[PDB]
């Protein structure tokens, strides 16, 4: 063939990666949804023209917010039809009907003009990527835990929040979640 199925494979792997991202962050999705075998993916996504349109490219992502037991607050993200927003990054959807989070995935043809307005709404951010096709055997990353009550640790160690080791905001693992200051 040609470089046709390559883009589909890239996008499918990225989609599975993002589903794993949200499930790890704490937004329940179906396990067989996260599996999404590529044959089923192309069966549901098969363009009459055989194009990345796939005749059903309406990728929608919505959260579950299961761990309200430990997180007193948890918002939502609306990632709809983010299959091919454009050839490059285009400011389109600054804010939607979500009040804590929001994810906009782009083809990494970054537009610094569109990179504005992001640090504007208090409860929002974005760190998306092209494929990001994480966890691997080469990866020695210890699984991360967001300690909602680190007050116990601070009391038992008699510390200040600064004296702990610092992981930067730009850390790719720290971007896997919406980790804050």
């Amino acid at each position: 063939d040609q470089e046709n199925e390559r883009n589909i494979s890239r996008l499918w792997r990225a989609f599975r990666t993002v589903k794993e991202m949200v499930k790890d962050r704490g937004y329940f999705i179906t396990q067989e949804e996260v599996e999404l075998p590529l044959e089923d993916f192309k069966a549901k996504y098969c363009d009459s023209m055989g194009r990345p349109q796939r005749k059903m490219m309406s990728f929608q992502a919505n959260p579950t917010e299961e761990s309200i037991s430990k997180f007193p607050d948890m918002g939502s993200l609306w990632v709809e039809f983010c299959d091919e927003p454009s050839v490059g990054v285009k400011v389109i959807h600054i804010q939607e009907k979500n009040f804590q989070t929001g994810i906009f995935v782009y083809q990494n043809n970054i537009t610094p003009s569109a990179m504005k307005l992001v640090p504007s709404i208090p409860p929002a951010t974005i760190e998306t990527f092209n494929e990001a096709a994480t966890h691997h055997e080469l990866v020695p990353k210890h699984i991360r835990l967001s300690s909602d009550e680190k007050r116990e640790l601070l009391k038992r160690y008699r510390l200040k929040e600064s004296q702990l080791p610092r992981i930067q905001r730009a850390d790719p693992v720290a971007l896997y979640l919406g980790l804050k200051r």
Partner: peptide, 27 residues
Amino acid sequence: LIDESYKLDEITLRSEYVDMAIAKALS
């Protein structure tokens, strides 16, 4: 004194917010 840098990145609908933190720090 603390890391509140990114909180006051947008206050002018600026120095008003920092008045609360200091009293909170001793609180």
